[PDB]
Subunit: 290 residues, 4 copies
């Protein structure tokens, strides 16, 4: 099993010097760095090549997370937005092909964060999204990318809140490059059973995000890690596990992730490194081959 | 230990014939019905005495929950909003005295639901709220009402997200009628420890809301009910336990609680009744004595 | 699911007036009374018919538990003990036919309690037991009795300590009416996973005994009841659930179950009744199909 | 917090070259090797100083476990056995002083393994044991040794089965060098609450043994490690944590610990080393700094 961390653990904006984080997580012993998609459209082919060379040089696999804007919303009733969204993903998936990235994850069926004052048309957004994702999935297959649909808690999204809804959506899309993605933080709110949710996802599970109930690094909170390892073994999980911890106030990250107290308890960069490496040791030990 | 349920388990709007729910809940064997404050300011003295007489006649204690409007925001930097809020609560608390209600709970330090797009000033809102609540507390004392501040998950408020923040706030207020209120749904997201959060609240714990991780009736989900029972025994909790299950899509309640799937699994009124009664037997059994 | 309790919860010896306990458990709302086999060989035909009629008239199903003596040890290297053991079981099973009982459970592959000072030959005892049990199973089948092999913790037997070992033994026996019986008390010691153990048992699970870690009535201890409910649903469990609580010091039951402190906390008969009824309500609610 | 492991994890007899295991556990990063007391009475003064020199040289602290024989039974009604027991402990405690060992633990109030076929006089054995242990405590105080009384499950002893019984016994002994010792394996059977047992022990807790429910190395089983870390922080635990895993059949160890299946799943010495090191990383990470 391959283990990663989201760069945003260290950063307060949805961009960074990803080369700095490739070198860091390689030293800490991770297999994977997850990076935000949003700066990638601002990269020259030179910058893409040198990011790929950095990843290759440090023995790191890159995965991509994206929180789509309202303008990138494949579910939108406005056919202009759906057309611009499809263009955005087509460009992005081609960048991912040049980057040697084989996995993108997030609320890719919708947008994030969402405007909850808007009138909700779940059945309408659902039907439009399935159609749109099925189209985008043809580009994802051409670019060698797993298009992973993140199951989110009710506060962040209305379309897909449980593993069962995720399986329903992906089954309805009916394309090999579209996968369910589960997140221990999101499962913690919506699911009756964590092991049950993972077994429900079964062969459709393409990615797993990890974090404690309050998004601390895995190990010292209430997430049932042993039950998760057992369920991953039950479904013969052939895929990666990326921890997505957020312990710092401030910036767009602190605001979007709604960190309103110092969850890090005054941690400096070296303290964040030590706890990430401890969480990685824990994750390899507890989650692997049951 | 007294056990209650929120009328809203059965209803898709923030008011109802509370007399109907007093009779139902009395027959199901509850001690307490929790009602929404919203319609109480508009009750004639006749309507108040009718509700009180109905509660007394059925052996049911009434408690009150409130989601304050933006106009009722005691943390507001706008002094006219603060003035309205203080007048609103002063009138409400006089009515609760007439109604023979001795407990109100909710985001009473702030408002709910909140506009999260607005720039956040936590320090400013905190200092203003502490001052505002301390004033309202003196009217709460006169009216014999425990003014209980609900600790909420980061998605619903930024001010008080943990039992420790709740205790810090309530100690700063420094008034005996102002209490911390915990909710298993909210603790499930923000707390390192459920038992730890309860022991942290200790003497300041004035009210407890219950529900599964996804707001189903207590019993068949992942909430550590036994650990809660033990912590309530540890602190010597002398308060009441009110379940706050939300399993129904539709209406303002469905929208505000963000129920985007049929969590009830097609339950009619009779089925909701039986599940509430089973959850009550479970709650009396698992949460008491320890 | 059908729910039972072992009479011995109320009694300090391996016999009693079972008619008294049939009437008690019918009143408390149980489906099943489990009784000890020990006195049954000393029942006249009319005593058997009386017990059967008492059970039938009260809507109660009788199940039988047996701790075999050294002289009833089907695993014994001594061929005379094996011969006497088979004659004992043959007579007992014919008595169970007269009683209209269709389930016997316990360490029926061995004896209980065992002498652990003896040199252990697990390999030899296992081979003899599979052979012996296969022969007795044919008598059980003719009598309409399921022969359920209890998986026990290491302190009570050496042959079958895990669900996997139980499955291995029952597969070797290769008789349809020979089943694995799991016990929450025994699984709590020996199993990596409770849900895993139940899913390992699968179609071989013919009976389930319940009790907290320290053998209190189900509900207020550390046994993961929700996980058990989920696993029973996963395997489509068709059988019954009998709680086997032991909370009283004194006599052969006190000594054999090794109760060396008052686990009942001074409970009189009415208190034992009420705790059993609360555990039954808990068990129906929490274990019932997910 | 100092972490150790019992040498017997690697060995099937109650002795070995302790210097070999000092070197090994130093290499694996342990602070402590726990050793069996059995061979220490057979040690010359030169051998004591050798082992002390090896320990100091490798930066390892030595702790001692003892399973008393029947003739070392401080609870015995036979005053000759009590006389011999006190002589045995007086000599052992003087050797410990020379070895530079400041902690001994086990069923030091009784013996292990016990003959459970004997008539049990719990009240008598308790009264004698308290008096006997109080006298030995004077010698322990002189030799600078913490005399740690292991709380055991009902299958291994009848005197002290819970942390509460442990505290009552130690408080009755009323001596600063006599401590309660808890074991995750034994707590897992007898305790209503793991956190609650540790908080019950509080200031009396002198030593903690760790192991999964079935005595595997900590981390991948059902023991609530986070809850343990929390309770240790609550009582400000000043002591060490020694893992006591037993995963191998064969010899006196296999027999006494009742390992009747290959729990090690065919692990060689190298594999046992790796799993102990994984469990140490897990234990340092999860059990500290709550
Ligand atoms: Mn995520
Ligand atoms: Mn609430
Ligand atoms: Mn049993
Ligand atoms: Mn031990």
């Amino acid at each position: 099993m391959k283990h990663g961390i989201y760069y945003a653990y260290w950063e307060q904006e949805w961009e960074a010097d990803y080369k700095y984080y490739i070198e860091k997580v390689a030293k800490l012993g991770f297999d994977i760095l997850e990076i935000a998609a949003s700066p990638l459209p601002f990269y020259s082919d030179i910058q893409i090549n040198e990011l790929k060379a950095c990843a290759h040089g440090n023995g790191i696999t890159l995965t991509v997370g994206h929180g789509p804007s309202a303008e990138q919303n494949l579910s939108s009733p406005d056919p202009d937005i759906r057309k611009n969204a499809k263009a955005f993903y087509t460009d992005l998936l081609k960048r991912l092909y040049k980057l040697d990235v084989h996995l993108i994850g997030g609320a890719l069926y919708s947008y994030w964060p969402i405007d909850y004052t808007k009138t909700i048309d779940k059945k309408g957004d659902w039907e439009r999204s399935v159609e749109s994702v099925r189209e985008v999935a043809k580009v994802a297959e051409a670019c060698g990318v797993d298009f992973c649909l993140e199951v989110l808690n009710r506060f962040e999204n209305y379309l897909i809140n449980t593993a069962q809804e995720g399986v329903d959506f992906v089954k309805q899309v009916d394309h090999n490059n579209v996968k369910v993605m589960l997140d221990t933080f999101h499962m913690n709110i919506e699911e009756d059973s964590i092991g049950g949710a993972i077994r429900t996802a079964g062969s459709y599970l393409g990615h797993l995000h990890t974090g404690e109930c309050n998004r601390k690094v895995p190990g010292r909170g209430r997430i049932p890690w042993v039950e998760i390892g057992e369920a991953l073994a039950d479904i013969g999980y052939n895929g990666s596990v990326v921890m997505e911890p957020f312990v710092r106030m401030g910036g767009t990250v602190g605001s979007n992730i709604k960190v309103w107290r110092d969850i890090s308890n005054g941690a400096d960069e070296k303290m964040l490194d030590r706890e990430a490496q401890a969480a990685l040791d824990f994750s390899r030990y507890v989650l692997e081959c049951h």
